[PDB]
Structure formats: structure tokens, C-alpha cells
Write a protein that binds this ligand. Sequence first.
Ligand SMILES: [Ca+2]
Ligand SMILES: [Ca+2]
Ligand SMILES: [Ca+2]
Ligand SMILES: [Zn+2]
Ligand SMILES: [Zn+2]
Length: 169
Amino acid sequence: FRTFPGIPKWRKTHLTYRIVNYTPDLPKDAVDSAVEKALKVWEEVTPLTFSRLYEGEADIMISFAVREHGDFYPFDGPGNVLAHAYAPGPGINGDAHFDDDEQWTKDTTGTNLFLVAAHEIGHSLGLFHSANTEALMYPLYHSLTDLTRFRLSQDDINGIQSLYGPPPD
Ligand SMILES: [Ca+2]
Ligand SMILES: [Ca+2]
Ligand SMILES: [Ca+2]
Ligand SMILES: [Zn+2]
Ligand SMILES: [Zn+2]
């Protein structure tokens, strides 16, 4: 596994998130859930907790975008870069942007929103790309299809617990 240089991390245990807008590809209950599941993934292995805001600037802002949007790094059309997130910190930091030129699905018949979000929220929390091929933070998304067997690999667990420790048991 790997962390960003200077090892940025949130100095607080409780973080807030906010879904800025929605995608035409999916009904809203499916977007909320994929984000909530994406967060449980990290909660289960650390003392971090998350709550939702509907106004105000949350720590982790989630949005759907096409081409040029509010930053220097515009998206590239269908395929390839699916989404990108910023390392933890103020403002644009911690935010996750998703390319709406992809077809977000709950299934694996396009780009599964849960798996990619789970991956981006890793970046939002302080994890860079983890070299293990079987790890969630590995930079190559493959249309898995078997979300029925998804388990955070030990490498991801090792890497996120180096940042915030194991959860209180
Ligand atoms: Ca932020
Ligand atoms: Ca793209
Ligand atoms: Ca789309
Ligand atoms: Zn962006
Ligand atoms: Zn990544």
C-alpha cells in the first residue's frame, strides 16, 4: 500500500459528506446507497464515522461532471478516467468527482458506482495507489461482475489503519 507524500490525513475522526448532484443514469436511492456502502467499507476497519449534510461545505463533496467543471483537470469522455478524488485537507481537498460520460450502474453492466466510489473515498481519506493487484486501491478497474465476493484486501486494511488505527472493539 501507499500514502500520499507528507502523509496527509484528517485530523478529526468524524467526517461529513455531501452529494452535490445526481446522474441521469441512475435513480437517486441507488446513488445514495452506493455512497453509503462505499463509506461503510472504511468505517468497519477504523475509528472514523461519517454523517451527511445537505447544505454547507462538507468535508467530502461528491459530484457528477462532464468534461470541464470546477477544476484544472477536465474529464476525458467515455471510458478511461472514470473518476478522481483529492487528498484529505481543506476546500477542494477530500472531494470526489465522477465522470458522467460513463454509464454508472448498480450492477456490472457498465461502471459500478460502488466499487469506484469505494476507491475514490480511499483517496479522500489519505491512501494513494496500492501496488497489490488484489487490492481495492490498485489503479486498474476491471469489470469484476462478482461483487458478491468483494472483501477489502488486507493491504487496504493495513494501509488505512496505518493512518487512523483499528476500530474500537
Ligand atoms: Ca473538501
Ligand atoms: Ca472518462
Ligand atoms: Ca452517464
Ligand atoms: Zn474534478
Ligand atoms: Zn485511484
